[model samples]
Target chain A: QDSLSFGFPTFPSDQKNLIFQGDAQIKNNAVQLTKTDSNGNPVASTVGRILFSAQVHLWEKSSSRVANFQSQFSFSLKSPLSNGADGIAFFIAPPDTTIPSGSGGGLLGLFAPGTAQNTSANQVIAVEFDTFYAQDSNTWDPNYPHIGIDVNSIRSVKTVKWDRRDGQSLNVLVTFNPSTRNLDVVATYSDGTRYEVSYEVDVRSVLPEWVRVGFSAASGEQYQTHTLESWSFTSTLLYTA
Target chain B: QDSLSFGFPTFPSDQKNLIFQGDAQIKNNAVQLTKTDSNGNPVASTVGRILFSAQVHLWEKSSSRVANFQSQFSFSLKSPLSNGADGIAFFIAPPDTTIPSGSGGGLLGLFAPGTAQNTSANQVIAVEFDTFYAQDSNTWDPNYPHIGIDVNSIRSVKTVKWDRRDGQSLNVLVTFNPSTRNLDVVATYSDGTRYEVSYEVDVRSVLPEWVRVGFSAASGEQYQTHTLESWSFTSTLLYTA
Candidate 1:
């Protein structure tokens, strides 16, 4: 069976499998994706991204069976007290796709500014951890840090507030269940803080059979540092009769 | 017969067993030990240390048997080009131990300045990743980055050049083999650069039946950032005889 399974305890300099974009860098056993200046500090209206080098098998067309995938990562976020305006996200996109130049700030580095919802030829599905709410720009955005699901549009189809600390980190585990067509996301903090969201999405409708999975983050007026410290992912098609 | 086995893929905010000292802090899933100011930028004449909260049994008093142990950790170091001095180390020490003050800089937080090479009542063993060569301060120091093994002294009993980039990281594995009475240390960089040192030592002679283990680092005049990203360790008594 063809599948994807990889684990990174730490991101070292010689990582041969990950593709870094914009401010994404492999430094000190961590993937630092930040809107930053020369000394690695946070900079406004900037973005950082990283993705798996190869495409994933999302389904088998002949058997009409979708793939079940599991992914978990430990990540960090450092936000200034007053200027914490953006957040991070894990996204699934078409093969060889990169964020557009104007896609910074509230776009989450996936959709361009002013791109209408449900209006893109190339589809992108994202699970976003959004920190700021722009009632004027993204009227649907919440006023604080929230988790949302987006497909082809910057507007989240479903949204929920995370309501945690401004700094430190959270552990995230996401699973795709083909049987129920549900994507599950669980975020945990050390002090027994946890949040989980399950959104129903038919992979066949929004995502392609062959796709790339990666992380994207943005900072607009205010900025924060994003770090992917450790990650493990597996995708399998299981059918035993 | 007793054992010790543990692994930390990432350090989260709720880590319970690590005792932090001085500037040592658990933030963003890493132990940051350095000379620093407010924003984590490296500062001068600063030191940090972290030790396991519990005691590790080294030998069985009645059975005439010693424990064999293995430890490996992935750590990061970021040094300013002109002022890259000092280094990091993994050390085994007496139970409930902490680094004394005035041991920053070339001393690596292990010994105070002006302290003689072989003059400590406490027995401590360390495997060090040294980035600078302090010839005037310590005549035995090498000119470049080096790895050294020390026992109750800042001067390494056995040392070798690491010869790696100063801004990234290296993975280190150390084993205490009771059968051969050898403590082996191997350090590897992502670029396939490797250095190994095997020194003969009888644990029963220099160490007691119980000890604590942790990491220590220092920066003085020239400073660098030290991060212990991930670590795993195991100790066992093999009575196959």
Candidate 2:
């Protein structure tokens, strides 16, 4: 009945200062921030992460300082995953970056991430509502932003934490099944509480076709300042449609 | 039995070049021209055409090009669709300057040469595999890489293509059903030969909730050069099952 549908407008009095500077980088460690709202229009900012098991997508592109609006938007960093890090997920995409991956971040223009981090054969794990933790917690204690099960990185083979900004308006979903390699991460919350982050990996025992999911934030250096606000991703076909 | 699966892990040779030269100024007399592959992957004809449709991705992007292996190729605009000079579509986006009214080159991104030439109802019709001659051009020019339909411009209504890359690949699909506005564009090539580029429009009408798709080439003075090889963009529903 509804395979896909998206329609978002109304952000264009002029472009609102290039939507706060169209953030998008994706490679030098990640970046995809955006802002603009007094009515000028442009509003990006939902940095990196989307690997729906290698469908692949990385972002970054800027231009437009003022004058109604022309361009500006950032985020780039989806290159690791070779034998190193392969666990990242974030979604909310649809300004038009294809589409699919967790389909969260409202209307999903942020694109949720999932490539199942390295070593899952044909990986597809998921679950990440991260709200900017930035190292310094010796181990764990950032206030909020944790619901882990990425498969390759982000460390938490299994994590849980909720209520920093209460996920600032979140929506997360994960469903995998590489023929019984079953996995789960479903943290949906507009205030409905569907937090069901599960796990199970075994693509013939562990990843191997090539892997690397996306997304990473690091305020470090005295809380440099962090940002991320949209995500989505999708992949199916193990049990049935 | 295989709906989708990815386990990537081999890409890190290193070669860098993420350069982007800039200059955009054409407000309505339109006709830039740049983008031609011929075989594929070489790109360096001095970039000309200032308008391409899609397909032409490249790989290798770390060590320093930023990320690595992110692709979204595109090519088109040999001159087709002039609904009286009112329809032209080409974009890979990410770069901007303001320009928009070069006839079909008008706005030079969202496309417009004759579907009423820049009707403006909000404008943000992402995903349109058109094959103009009008009849809403078979609903959207599916599998007709040369045509398939999945546009949401109000209700999907396209029909104009006296000449524009006549036909080749022909297999692209852009579908939508904004409450039954029912948009469609289906094509099938590879010797199958199927067609159905449908349209209904009203899925917002003109577009502009967010606009910025990439790729643009140019080489004037009566045509100079154009090249863009190796590209990518996939979502058969995220690789289908």
Candidate 3:
């Protein structure tokens, strides 16, 4: 079994077990993924990234190749002025915690692309709240901000426009069920409306038995404040009879 | 023993055990104490009061009258524009959960004037974060926003200017020690500096043994958003050895 919950009134002091990389700082009673510095410069860059140190494995290598897990969290994004650029993502990566160089902006700090996408030997899955829609890309919807499910690629398997207002608190629920091989995502707004989307993914085919779970966020030429309010996760390990 | 912790990712379903009065709503993954309606009207009030129903007794009637307890929480206030108005408070009131009519603005919805200030037999103690300082009153410091310790009156026994920025998250810790009969309050900023104030208070002399512990907030002619990110409280029952 694996379970954890955090509501950051203050930074958790056990740094030996946690990681803080790039512009990520515990501020304002929550984990600020990115912020503007004293000099008024965005701490995150066009290709800059920040990573929190704490990591969790959904299940052990020997016990469960198949598992059921659910996570819930609250988040908000505030633009310095009128419009926000780029976005944030929740990710599950390999055992190694490394920030890919030259990965920023629409990449959401989750990937570093070479000549082709999804070619990196290191596999990762990400659920991204993308604010910017690159005009040249066919995959992104230009009319509204959206969430994307990425599997070893920034191109989403599914995408839905984010309907909540900026700065309002929003809740996200992500669940993975092994029996159906389905990854379900739902976002609930303050007014009680819900938007849900799902994708079929076989974890054993794309990810290792042991993996790290955390979040990553980025800013491009235009920027916004990405904050993680609270998070909780629970999972059950599987055993062969 | 009285100990409780709540992280409002979703509204707790047991409404009978809890109370929601006036403009408070559980939304956005936290308890939204105040908000603007779809039409842009303040949901909290120009003269509004919101209360959570759960009540805690400071100590048993037959046991030692004195008790010690501490509470910690994270909060934020955001203005729709450049400046915000009014404020919020944590209060200990009589067993009755009642809203004082015609109370708003500088009152923070904790009291309403009668024949005299603090004369109301329904005694109450509050720790207030006052954003607006009316120029007519000598008790308010017009120079800056401040927090006050109010006993049976809105007039504070001690007051200190608030040091944190408006929209940034803030950490507040409040403690009471019966042996010393001292009530201590501290607010910690993200930069690590701390602001603290204390007053000697015999809670039993001012309040009933069984009291209700919760929060209240208000807006007046001007308005802003008041939110609680998280809250936890713990206390031991004092008994004869």
Candidate 4:
């Protein structure tokens, strides 16, 4: 699973490479992580995750460097209730981790409400595409839609505001360099408007030696269509911890 | 010239579309815009310009929209002293303007020392790759190397730090949306580490309707080899002002 390229142009396959948790499911060939009601009205709070089941080797205990990796995913969001609520994330998680139970709203399915700052849970490292601003010193969300880098906390280490192209496919590429510890993201819309963010953190300090990589999303009082249209990922080097 | 695509893979050709000024000249393949002295030592404060000889129709006086445009350029820089100083810029300038005689230092050859804030000269709209930090309330130079957007002033309207992938080709894509007034720039290093910045400003406020587009660079006490390896540009729509 770590050697070459694998992607889902449209999902709902019989393949064993992926796992779905909470409210996530295949609907009309895309991963529907959050939804509106059956009658297409706003629903109660919903949360879900779709992740790679196989754990990839992240780093060796003897080395300071993590494995270099690159992933590209295309997704879009549509709202019946304004610009939507809560957010979505692409994450690297502990091998034994599961969708946290109290993960609705803006927690993005990566942590429980009270576990956002816990070092013991060591739950995940994530990049969030946040649409709604949930402010306070703790949330630290920007007023506009933004991209953030997380190292086991809900508050991002840094963030850059996002420009939305409205109803267009939003494309993102997340790339990491092992030796330099640079994690960079570049997101472009159909009209070619792009948002970029770069933050450097040594993954060896955040995750275990083995990890699962995938996405998670959630909806709150204001709901919307949160869909994952397509994804492709590649990584360089594999070492035993 | 805005209708199709034409590029210089390796330059120094007998091309009719481009003009070179000041110390700019062809060496080997790339256009060497600033150079080392004959003794291979850092020379006097240097300045140069290389531009498309054709002027582009930027906007129409009768319309509210500017033409959408896109450009790509690849360049590499090397310094014998340190990280290099001053910097280079990609600019859209008033059609009749020449390289300013008093241009040097952190202005990137786009402005004379005393003329940086003048509206009548109405010189340029530029994106600068600034390697040196000239600090003060006027410059607001971030300590790190940065990418900046300039509109008729030496000071940038916005800036994002640049991560250098030493000795490698740096790739840039500049895209503009006339209706949305979004000007976005993305730069990627060979390892694929990327830097992105977006600013929204109408060109009508800073430039003449007809403009010459090209590059300018300068060197101060610290100098470097400023070269243009390749460039390609295309734009949509051509309307009379």
Candidate 5:
């Protein structure tokens, strides 16, 4: 049987959230997991909901000396992400589902705003491929959207115009090794083209070792609804917890 | 330098007929050749105004015992073969374009029905990917067309589909080897997906060593138009006259 064709329980319309058990190890090579609907049908959706959680025990940390930590672990989307948008999130948080809401854009609904006293309370490091713009205290132009690597609840690494279309497949790879303590992130298109965004990050100075890995997205009041494809992980070496 | 960014030529309205040369070597694992006008502009015509020629020399003869002399090759179109019901022709001629008019489509303009009864005359083998159904007992239905692999005076080796869409990219591949003296024709899509409807010819009893490869398309009363993107050719063994 093809590994990509394996069965994953379909998320019922009413559930609003889906969860799976067992810690999915980010193997040396990519571990591909696909999502399909009931009756083993291929579901192409524009408006849908998805929430994934895994026991991502990060036993390693990227180097603390590098100004920008670069690592890559891709999340494949079964369906296309929204145009001007790249879906999925790589979160650095405690292993819990009690996620908080933040500003509209610039790491929307993920990290707290700097104006708020508890802005750095979450201390999450994230990068987003957003199609549309939302309200962030620091507003970039609408056309130039945003993709950023946030640090200590503040967006430290950011850029936009990364992925430009919907119904087109895209990938994100993130890597962080504790031995070298260096992290890197890279993006690839379906046409087999890669664009490296960040190269070096000192994990000890920015993020902890054991952090949560997941994603979140809302249709919001402005743009039309959208759907998610799938999220996965890959690693350079195995870590024994 | 990128290979896809080649320039087109310009042409004068008075000068209609044109022939261009192409590299037999494959590019990016694919074969594609294209031509425009004298000034390097794209040539667009619905009626039979332009003809493309590719020179190929077949030397081997196939044995009957080897999978019926299997070989395949295809040509792609930037636009459909027909708009106002015009059609196109793929032919193996004797290096000269002085064939009679109304003789193409199947005769490859090398002969006229009953007007010419030459069997070993220049030894032409043509496969017409027809669009309009000519009522002259020569053309078939406009829907399910035919493939006429004329020996000399436009005869039928086989016939298939005469679909009705224009401006869409079209493709057809031909395979022939001298060892077994057989020919196979296969068609492909813009995305490189191949479909059935290929025809095979026994070269041991048909075409000889050196042959000319060429194509022609025409738009009749109900004119339609198309473009040619690129073209190529390749072989594992050396081909010599």
Candidate 6:
């Protein structure tokens, strides 16, 4: 059992323990998930995705029956044009994670075409910062820019419009309490305006006892640079009951 | 029994695992070690010292008889006056570390008056960024603004003048190899000038098998702001025979 916490001011050279799949790279002291290449050109494909995961799981259900955790991060999404790319998300996924090959745009790299709505059996939970409108029939609110709490499906059960200024940093805090089975999210802008949303989730129903936690991002027809300035996480490992 | 690595851009709220012994605060995504208060005033004394350490040791001698490690960090020392006051240091010390109460000026918060030359029995090693000149006869080089490697004593085994401009970021790298018993330090200035220094020491003679690693800074009669922009460290643990 263990706890983990770190803030990324710059990319540490000893990142062999991290999983960086697709077009992710370290730039300007931040983890740039997508948008540009080493040559400073837009990615080759119209649909680009990047997935970064910790090599080790946050905790194992087999050893610890339940876990409580909190994660905080700062991010910036910028584009040459108005409004940004598809979006970015924080997720907890099963072992052997991979980028959804056909998943881009509104999918936020979480699911492929046919499986977008069938995530219940796929085992993943995500909180998405969506910048584009996806007129999916499942449950998407018509709002173009919003934050959504998702479980298994991209159609969010809860969402709020993203109201912060563009190009400035937004700080997001996510906390999960195992005893109450509640997930809370709070986002604060530089001006001190804050938005908070919460949901009741029995994580055991959506994920195994052990899971990998990380960030994923994607760019669709309209592209923008998605970068994470810093991130820190704290979790208590619970012993099996 | 475990390995840990982290990079700091901002101060983590859950810093219970770190030891902050004096006037250290997190500001503007960096660790401000000394010289200012929350109200931006001098912190109660003309001479101040602050020490920040990781709660855990770098490696245990019993578990890893021989350890190899590297640490890199960026810093900026700003003075309203022409030259900065006192200096800063990176150190490895045994458990229950404390700030040297009477150790200001050129001591860099690592030693006191009477114990300065008698460090042979003190279980500590340090790499100091000294901005002041101390005229002690023991081993004072009479050079101001220098980088020194000190073991047990405030007097340095090796010292190099700090030739970089004020308020500019300086990059420093320190590496230790047990096999060669060599410790190497390299400092790069914003203008591309680099200084390299190395020293040989049987670390086990001066430090225990396990030791806490951290940074310390101080302000003397003349005051200046000492800040750490970012820092990262990685170490390999080896099995003992």
DockQ of each: 0.01, 0.04, 0.01, 0.01, 0.01, 0.03
What tens digits encode model 1's per-residue C-alpha lDDT throughout A31-73? 8787556676677878889987545767656557687888888
Preferred candidate (lDDT higher): 1 or 5: 1
Model 4 per-residue lDDT tens digits across residues B1-241:
1222235555644333467877877675777777667754445488888887545656656544366788789887777666576788898887777877678867678888777867566557899998888565226577788899887777788899886544478899998888778999999987778899999987887787667788888887777777788887666443433
- Which lDDT tens digits does candidate 2 get at residues A1-241? 0011111111112221111212223221322332223452223223223222222211111211111101111212122111111112442212223333442232112223352223332233334545445345323323445556645343447767753332133444445554445565565546576566566665333332222333333211111112333333333212222
- Write the residue-wise lDDT of candidate 3 on B59-150 in tens digits: 54554645577767777887766446677788787767677775666677777755116545448878887787767642444467888788
The chain A TM-scores for the candidates, taken one by one, are: 0.92, 0.27, 0.84, 0.90, 0.57, 0.87
Clashing residue pairs in all predictions, respectively, total: 3, 178, 2, 0, 78, 1
Decide which is better by DockQ, 3 or 5: 3
Q: 2 or 5: which has the higher DockQ?
A: 2
- Chain B, TM-score, each prediction? 0.93, 0.23, 0.85, 0.89, 0.57, 0.87
lDDT string for model 2 (B173-239, tens) is 4344434555454445446665555555543233322223333443221222222222222321111
Sort the predicted structures by lDDT, highest score first.
Answer: 1, 4, 6, 3, 5, 2
Off by over 4 Å in 2: A1-241, B1-88, B97-241
User: Could you tell me which 10 consecutive residues in candidate 5 chain B have the lowest summed lDDT?
Assistant: B1-10
The per-model lDDT (C-alpha) reads: 0.77, 0.30, 0.65, 0.73, 0.40, 0.69
Model 1's CAPRI class is: incorrect
Better by DockQ, candidate 2 or 1: 2
Runs in model 5 lying further than 4 Å from the true structure:
A1-241, B1-55, B60-83, B102-110, B115-122, B136-143, B179-181, B190-194, B235-241
lDDT of 1 at B206: 84
TM-score for each of the candidates: 0.50, 0.24, 0.47, 0.47, 0.34, 0.50
Highest lDDT scorer? 1
Encode model 1's per-residue lDDT on B1-241: one tens digit a residue.
Answer: 1554556666655544578888898776788888556776777778899886545667755557687888889988876556576789999987767677578888888876666376455488999888878677657676767899988788788898787465567888999988888899988888888889999998777887778788999888888888899887777654423
Scored against the true structure, residue B30 in model 1 reaches a CA lDDT of: 81
